[model samples]
Target: PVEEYLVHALQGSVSSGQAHSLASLAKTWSDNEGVLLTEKLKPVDYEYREEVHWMTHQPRVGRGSFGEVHRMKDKQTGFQCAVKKVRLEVFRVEELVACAGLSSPRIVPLYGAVREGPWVNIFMELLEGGSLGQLIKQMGCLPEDRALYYLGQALEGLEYLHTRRILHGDVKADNVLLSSDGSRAALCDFGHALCLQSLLTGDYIPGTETHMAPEVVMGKPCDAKVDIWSSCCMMLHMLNGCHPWTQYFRGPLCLKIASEPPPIREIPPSCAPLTAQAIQEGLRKEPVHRASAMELRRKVGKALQEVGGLKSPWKGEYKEPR
Candidate 1:
C-alpha cells in the first residue's frame, strides 16, 4: 500500500522521535493523494533537505497555533518566503488542504509543503506588514473607519471561503496578515479550517474560545455563520484593542459565550450606527439568525463610508481606551 510506503519513508528519514500519529496521517494521505504537492510547491524528494535547498532567517517571524513560522530563502532561486514547521506526529492535513491552490488575494498563498524527517515544512508567502494582532497591540485601538475597513476586507475573505463551503474556523486578528504598505489584508493560518460538506463526517475543530459562537460552545453542528460570529468578535477586538470578554471576565469564557448573550455590549458607543448594527447581526446566537459574510460585508462597507473612510494610518499613536 502507498500509505504504508509513505509511512515507512517518513520513518526511515528520521533517526528520531516515535511516530505518534503516523497511522492517521498515512490514512489521510491515502484519502487525499497529491494534495501536498502543488504547482507552486513541488513534491519532496529525499535530496531536498533544509539548509541545502533553503535557509531560515533568524529569531523566527511568528508562531502558528501548532508550529513556529520562519522567514526562509531558496538557496538556488534566491526566492524569499515563509516556512511553518509542524511536527509530523501532530500535523493536520487540513491545514495544507484548506489553503493549497486557493488564489484569493484576501487569503494567503501557499507555496508548497515538504516533509523532511519528523517535520513537515509548509511554505507560504511572507506578508511583511505583520498581523492585525500586532497592529492592535501597537496602536491601542483602531479608529472607527480603519476598523471598518479591515473588517470589510476580512469579510470579503470570509465571503470567498464560505461560497466554496470552506469555513475559516479561526477568524481572529492574529490570523489576518497585512501587506508591506498595509493596503492589503490576507487571511492566514488555516490550521482549524473545516469544509462544510465534511461536517457530518466529524472533522470539526474548535477555534479560539473568545471568538467561538454559541453553537460552537454548546457543541452544536456549525456552518459558515460560525465564522461570521468570530469575524464580528474580531471587529470588537479591533475597535477595543482587546478581545471581548477579556475586559470584563476571566477564565472559562466558553461558559459565558454559551449562556450569556453575544458581546454586543462590548461595541464602542462612539461607533457609527451602521457599524454597531452590522456587528449585532453577525453576533446573533442562532446560526440561522446570524448575518452571512456577504450581508455583514455590505453593512461594514457602508459603515466605513459613513465614517469618512480609512483616515488613520496603519500604525498610529496609541489612544487610551475609556
Candidate 2:
C-alpha cells in the first residue's frame, strides 16, 4: 500500500526518461567495488581507498557468515554504522541492490556501498545489542516474555516486507540484531531476500540449508513462505535454546523435517503455549499451512503483551519481562 505512494512519486519524477529521481539514485547507486552504483549499473572494478572522513572501529557484532561486520563512525553526519563486506560470490550485486531498495527502521539501513578492485563494501546502521547467539551464549535460556518481544518486533518488520512481496529467505535468530540496550530489535542480512511473483509458486534456492522449509527442500517451487519457516525456527531457538531436529540434513531431509516441523511439546518447555502453537504453524512442513505474517502477528500479539510484562531471564533489572 505504501509502495503505491512511492511508485506514484517515482512516476511523477520522470525526467530524462527515467522512472527514479536523481536524489533516490544517489543513495541507491553509490559506487561499491565493480558494482556500478550510478546510471545503468555496469560492473567496474576499482581500488578501495580508505575513506578519509570515515572513522573505523573493529567489529563489535557479527553473524560469522559472509564477511565480518564492523562498527564505523561517519565523521560528516556523526552517524554510527555497520560495514559489511560482500563475500566474494555471484550474489553480491543483486543482494546489495535489493537491500538498498527496501527501507525500514526495523530493517538495517543500507547507507551506501563502496568498491575496491573485485571487492565490494556495504554500510548500514550499527546496532549495539548482540545477536541471539550472543544473548543465549551469555544469558542461557531466554524467558518467553523476552522471546515474544523479539518475535512481535520481527513480525512487524517481516509483515511489511511480505506485503511488498519481499521474502527474506533467511529469517533465523542470528538475523535479528539488537540495539545497544536489549529492549529493541531489528532484522538484518537481506542476502537471501526474494520478491515473490503475484502468482507466487515454486521452490527457491535454499538460503540456509538447515532452515529451508519442506517444499523448498523438495526442491519444488515455493514462495515467500520459506521465510515464515525460517522465522518459526528462530522462535524455536529462542524458546527451546536450539532446534530439536539435527542440522545435519544437507538437502531434502531438511525440507521434509521443516515440512513437518516438531510439535510444540516436542520443543523445550521454556516455550509458552502460544509460542509452541506458533512454532508448529510457522514451521509447518507444508508451505501451504504455514502462518501468514499477519496471522502470526495477530495470534501472538496477546501472548506477547503478557510476556512483555514478565521479568527477563537475561536481566536482573527487568521490571516486567519485556
Candidate 3:
C-alpha cells in the first residue's frame, strides 16, 4: 500500500517519463534492495545508471538532512552538478515538490532526480563558491556591508518563496550557496520546506535550533514570518560568526527562544544603526510585528548602503567576531 501510494504520487507530481522511470526503479530496488518527483537531466532512451551515465566526484561535498551530497558530472553533456543521495524509505516527496519547476535565480535550480537501487539521487546546479557557512568559517565573520548585501539577496529569495506561499522552513548560512565569485547567493536544501497552505491543516518541521522562531519554539502556528526570523538569525551568524543563542546559553536552546526576549541585544554594537534596526524588526517575537521579506529586503539594502556598499572582497582578511 505504501509503495503503491508513493508510485501514484510520483506519476502525478513530476514529469511523465521520469516519474514512470522512478516507479520502475523503485520496484526493481524493492525486489532486490529504492526516488523524486524532475526530468531536466532528461532520462535517456535507456536507463540512467549512476556510474554509467554520470560519475560522482571522489569526496562528497556536504551532508544534507536526509543524505550526503556529492559533485557529479554527466558523461555525454559534460554538465557538472551536485547530487544528494536519499534512501528510498526516507525520501521526502515535499522536497522535490517544493523545488521542482520553480525558476528563480535566488533559489538553486533543480537539475533532476534519479533512483538507483536504494538511493534517490537529487541533482542541482553546483555552486562553485561553496556555502556562506564555509565562507564564515574561513573569514571568521563577514564585514557589516557584505553581510547586509548577502542578507538582502537571501531576503529576495524569501520574498519569492513567501509570495508563492512556500516557506523555506530552514533558513541559515549553511543552506545558502554562493556563486563562483561570491557575488550571487542562492537558497538550497528544501528538505525542511513547507507549503503554507498545508499548515492550515499539520506536521511542523523544525528548522535549526538556533534559527528557529519564537512561534516554532512555542508550538504555535507559523507563517512566512518564521523564515524572516530565521533569516535574521542567519544575519547575526554572518555578522557575529556564530548563531544567536549558542554564545550565551547551553542545554536545550528552544526553552530560551520561547522565554527570553528576542536576541536583538546580540546585534553588534558597532553595526550601523540601520543594520541593527532591520535585524531588530525581523526578530520581533510576534509574527504580525515582524518584518516581511519585502520590508526586510528594503531595510537590508539601505543598511548595506549606509555601511558603504560591500567594499570587502568575498575572501578577505579574517577578523574575530565580537
Candidate 4:
C-alpha cells in the first residue's frame, strides 16, 4: 500500500534540481533496509513531497511555529531520524522547501517530506546533543574559546542563509544545536525564516521579543541584521551564563529594546574587553550600524583562534554537560 501510494504521490511536476535530488533520494533510501518509496509505478504531476512511512515515534524534541519535532524510526529500514509534523499551510511548506535545499553543513539537513490531509511530515537529521541553551544551563558558563567557537559556527550558518537571501527571523542559543558527535553546532528551526522577496513586500515577521533587534522592536523596516543582533545576545548569554539584559526587563520589552542601550551595567568577569566590544557593536541601537554577519564572523573567528590557540578556529574542545 505504501509503495503504491508513494508511486502515485511522486508523480508530479519537479524542477530539474528537484529531479536530481529525487534521483539521489532513491539511491539513499535503497541502501536502507526498510525503504519502501522505491517501487516502480506510473508517473504523475509532482511537487516536492516524498512518501515516507515511519513505524515508531518518540516524544517531541521541541516545537516551532509550524510543527512539533519528534524522533522517529523508519518503518521500512529501521533508520532513526527527526520528524517534524506541520499543519499543511503555504508558509510551512515553504519552510520545508527552504530547509531541504540548504547546502551548508552548519545547518541541519532536511531529508524528506510526506503530505497527508491537513498536515505534512518533514524528516530531518536528529541532533542528539540538544540546543545550545541546554548546554549553557548545564555548564553554567562556557569557556571563552568554546563560546567563540560556537558563535563562529553559527555565523557561518547565518552567512550562508543570508547569502541565499533567506533571513532567519530568530537566532538564539535555543535554536543552535550541538552535533551529536560534539564537534560542531548547526542552525535549526526555520519556521520563521523569510525570503528577501517576502521582506521586500513587507511581510509580517515574527520572532522572540527578547531576542529581537531594536529596529524591529521600534516598528521599523529591517533586514538580516536582526539575526546579527540576536546572535550577539546569545553570545552574551554564553559568556555570562545569564540573561544578557536583565536590567531592562521592567517595562514593556519592545519599549526597552527600542529606547535603551544594551543592559551591560557591568561586563561579567568572564567577558574579555574585545569580546564585549564586538558584541556591543552588534547590539548597536540602529540596525544600520550593527555588524554584518560576515563582519561578526571575522571578528569572532579571530577571537576564537587567538583565544583558543587553535590553527583552525572551527576546532575546539568539546565539553560534556555537567
Name the candidate that leads on lDDT: 3
Residue runs of model 3 more than 4 Å from their true location after superposition: 1-42, 59-67, 198-204
**Global lDDT of each candidate:** 0.77, 0.60, 0.80, 0.65
| Candidate 1 least-lDDT 10 residues | 30-39
Reference-based TM-score, model 1: 0.85
**What stretches of model 1 exceed 4 Å from their correct place?**
1-46, 59-61, 65-67, 198-204
The model with the greater lDDT, 3 or 4, is 3
Global local distance difference test of model 2 = 0.60
Candidate 1: what lDDT?
A: 0.77
Assess the local accuracy of residue 264 in candidate 4 as a C-alpha lDDT between 0 and 100.
50
- Candidate 1 lDDT, 175-261, residue by residue in tens: 999999888999998878876672324444567888988998887888899999999999999988889998778878889888898
As a whole number from 0 to 100, the lDDT of residue 20 in candidate 3 is 41
TM-score, ranked from best to worst? 3, 1, 4, 2
Worst 10 residues of 4 by lDDT: 27-36
Q: Write the per-residue lDDT of candidate 3 for residues 1-322, one digit (tens) a residue.
A: 5766655544423232443444343343321112333333443443566877678876654545444888887776777789888777766666766666677989998766766657777778899898898899889999998999999999999999999988899999999999999999999988788876723233334579999899987878789999999999999999999999998899899999999999998999999899999999999999999999999999899888888888998898998976
Clashes of 3: 1
Clashes of each: 0, 20, 1, 9
